[model samples]
Target chain A: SFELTQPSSVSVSPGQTANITCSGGYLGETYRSWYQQKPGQSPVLVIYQSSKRPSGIPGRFSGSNSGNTATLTISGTQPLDEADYFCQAWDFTSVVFGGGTKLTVLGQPKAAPSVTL
Target chain B: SFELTQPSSVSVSPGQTANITCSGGYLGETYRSWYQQKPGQSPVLVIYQSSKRPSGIPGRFSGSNSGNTATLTISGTQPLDEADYFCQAWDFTSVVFGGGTKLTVLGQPKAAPSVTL
Candidate 1:
């Protein structure tokens, strides 16, 4: 049995690349891992951490790590992915997911276009 | 887009019960919603806020609410749902999930049964 550890919190600037690491003490290579809970629908695998991209994941989202720390990085901040992001890993019995990081898109606010003529 | 409001955290005893509420401002008799992120695996729809069970969810987990407030009640804590619980509601384009509630199960910590004698 192993435990996953992540930073309690994280903050990043818009357009500036940011990364979150998921570390678990386990011995293995090619263990499938990725991020989950993107905001609304069910969890999506952002990056395979093994350098394999799941189907349909944007290229901007990439993953890398050393030893036990797996990382998920977003090149640019999009309001869509501003929701909480978590890293998950599995070992059959059950998968372990990160605590989650709250992402806030920083920059100018976009206002709705005028409707009335 | 509407926001889902829920308690930041909640705690309960092992055998005791606990409930968390999710309130939103969507107008509709049946807006599909439920809790997500159990421990491992993908998010499972525990209770469809509209009172419809997804598929194989146990009866012990139930849902209820009034007006815009939806409630998820865990009849008896089994130390399994102790992971962070979240409430979610959907409109059309995208679904909105509550921030999340940290559930800390309190009681005697069960030890792994010994196999060797």
Candidate 2:
């Protein structure tokens, strides 16, 4: 059976980039797809076949592969992008998903509050 | 375009049966898959291609499809089986997942705790 591996978690600030890697399984043996899922919601397809974005997906989200590792990269991340991302591969007969990566989009640093005299 | 529908939740007792249904997409499609997800963990494949089980999956877990609906039935439910279950379908272009079903294993009714007066 095919399997996929990914980082447990990732963190990035808005306007920065977030890249998650997925490994294992036969490289190029089948199509690869990526999904983003928020808590209590069904996963939404972000990229298919390693690069093709589904309709309405922002262009900032992209996918690529090198050797046995496939990567999903989110550019200029936003607060709404903080969710669990999964990578899946299909081998003609079956499909398998990576363990998933929890993306934490850190908000901007805050300034110290002024003290009253 | 394709989509899947599943009940929000289901409950069963130990030694009893539990069934979850998924509907949508073409009826004869064979790329359907079922997965079980525990809290804070990735989903584990239960059944693939509508009825094929992955290695090491219990025989009690089975899948079947009729018309536009697919079913995953657990013959004898167990406490460990309490988790979120999801069904997915591939339509040659992309994959879509159902809203997911939360399975709860109801414990057996027992005598009230003995009060030590």
Candidate 3:
């Protein structure tokens, strides 16, 4: 059976970049797709064929493939991007998905409160 | 891009059959696939190309298509089979999935306790 592997979780600071990799055995002739899903919601296609982004999707999301691994990168990460990302590849007649990576956007820490007079 | 529509939820009893329908606008020349996803887990493909079941999947799980609609049928429902199901179709370039259907298995009612003497 065909399968895809991915990191369990990832964290990135706002305005930084987040790269999640999906790897498998000999994904030759099979194009890959990327999806983003929030809690209790269906996944939405963000990138297809490794690099093409669907309409209305921001340019910060991109995908690439090398050898048997495909990568989905999110530049200028935002709090809204804190969701699970999945990568999928077609195996001739069927499709297989990675375990999925949960992304957490780290917010900046608050500054110390001013000393009382 | 193609889109698939499915019932939001369905309820069935153990040993009974459950059928979920997925309808689309125009599928073009693409094939449809069905997947099952449990809470906090990635989806697993059960049927592909409308009627072909993947390895390890039981015979009771089947799929079919007519016109722009596709159907996933479970001959005998089980409590373990309760999960969200989605139907997907590819448009040569990209894939789209249905809204997903949540399956709930209603267990039999418990017998009333005997009255004290």
Candidate 4:
């Protein structure tokens, strides 16, 4: 079967941020990236590792790491931040996506983390 | 400058198929993958390495390759698959996405390619 092996599940208090990551291995060349999908909405990429954004992404949401591991940190959580987050990797032409992370924004609308890959 | 080389455009007969690919490189470890994005819709995961679909995807759409180069083949094209196809990769926590490939279905879309990672 196919397994992306994401965190089975994660829980965070309202107003607090969490980090979700997708890790895997492949036979061909590999590249790492990030993406974000809101409920009933398509995914938008916030950041691309090699090509970092000039202004930098939101403080609440940040990404960094090495090798097969990447970290997406949600600084402060908000109810709206309560959505699905995923990490992705690629090898050659094949692509791999992290199963997904469930983010629950506890308090009022905190700044939603941006998608960076 | 950062670059994800994708075909500028493509054309295919309705019943025919086309293949789009995203090629890029990164600093850290890389994992390549594929995704399909219909107009206004979110990008859906078609295939992932390491984990392969059991039933196998449609013959119309297929993926296989090595290094920074990945191929998404659309066998019998369809009007529906006319949207843009993208290739993505990840390294550690960060991720990268290809520019995007445009697929055109000619006739009544004899068939659409299934999304496989």
Identify the candidate with maximal TM-score: 1
**lDDT of candidate 4 over B1-117, digit per residue (tens):** 222222212231122122333333232545645453334455432322221122212133222211221122222122222132223233222112112222222222122212243
DockQ, all models: 0.02, 0.01, 0.01, 0.04
Candidate 1 local lDDT, B23-98, one digit each (tens): 3223233333444443434433232223222222223321211111122333212212223212322122111211
Q: For model 1, what is the C-alpha lDDT against the true structure?
A: 0.25
Model 3 scores a TM of 0.12
lDDT scores of the candidates, listed in order: 0.25, 0.25, 0.25, 0.26
For model 3, residues B58-114, the per-residue Cα lDDT tens digits are 123212211111223332121122232123222222111112222233333222212
Root mean square deviation (Cα) for candidate 4: 33.7
In candidate 2, residue A25 scores what lDDT?
28
Q: What are the iRMS values of all candidates?
A: 32.9, 31.3, 31.6, 33.7
TM-score of chain A of 1: 0.13
Per-candidate TM-score against the hidden true structure = 0.14, 0.12, 0.12, 0.11
lDDT over C-alpha atoms for residue B108 of model 2: 31
Per-model TM-score of chain B = 0.13, 0.12, 0.15, 0.12
- Which model scores highest in lDDT? 4
Deviating ranges (above 4 Å) for candidate 4: A1-31, A38-117, B1-75, B79-117
At residue B48, give the lDDT of candidate 1: 27
lDDT ranking from best to worst?
Answer: 4, 1, 3, 2
Residue B113 lDDT, candidate 1, scale 0-100 = 19
* Candidate 2 TM-score versus the reference: 0.12
